[model samples]
Target: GHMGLEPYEISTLFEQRQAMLQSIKEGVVAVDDRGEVTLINDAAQELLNYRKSQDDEKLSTLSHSWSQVVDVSEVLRDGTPRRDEEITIKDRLLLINTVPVRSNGVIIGAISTFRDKT
Candidate 1:
């Protein structure tokens, strides 16, 4: 989905935002209104032990796989931000923050930023 952004803007800005998210040290996982992964940074993929599909298609099932660890859809529907919650994945504890993404007074998506507690 376009996340309500202009189609033209989504193409140009998506790359820039992708790079920006990649620069962050914390793992970043952003999903659209439907909770389908819209963007996932290198840190996040690495932390999740994710390997890209050979066909180069977007990982739409990411949210499904990630649901057991953290349910980002809660933030999307509740419009509430969650902060500094701890969870374990692969024996590593992570501190995570989940927040809804808004556009024009509408909650368009949600994002989760997390880092190793160690």
Candidate 2:
């Protein structure tokens, strides 16, 4: 082929990645450097009891802040990873891990993965 893949090929790959995320049991959430939610998987939606509202009022960022559970901002700021930490959010308990996402040794964003303890 050419020097790189076509646009359609990139789209297909992205679709596959999303599909994989949805299939995972652990809740997965990722935010950009600006703290905008870039990805939230189906398991995360179920765990967080989140409901998407009207398409017109759509927000790309997360409505509920997870700062109480795991402060993702710290991970983004320090580029350090936290693993297997127990956190309590209301009556629910969770085992969560947070890590910084990097590209070319530069911190680009962060991701948090968690699952219910109860």
- Give the lDDT of residue 32 in candidate 2: 61
lDDT of 2 by residue, 31-97 (tens): 5655355466665566556464331122232223564644655665775656554465776555555
Q: Against the unseen true structure, what C-alpha lDDT does each candidate score?
A: 0.57, 0.56
Model 1: residues >4 Å from true position, as ranges?
1-24, 41-74, 88-92, 102-104, 116-118
Check candidate 1 and list the clashing pairs.
none
Residue 8 in model 1: lDDT:
66
lDDT of 2: 0.56
lDDT of residue 100 for candidate 2:
77
What is the TM-score of candidate 2?
Answer: 0.38
> How far is 27's C-alpha from truth in model 2 (Å)?
0.7
> How do all models score by TM-score?
0.38, 0.38
- Where does model 2 exceed 4 Å of error? 1-24, 34-39, 42-50, 54-74, 88-93
Candidate 2: give the clashing pairs: none
Cα shift from native, residue 91, model 2 (Å)? 12
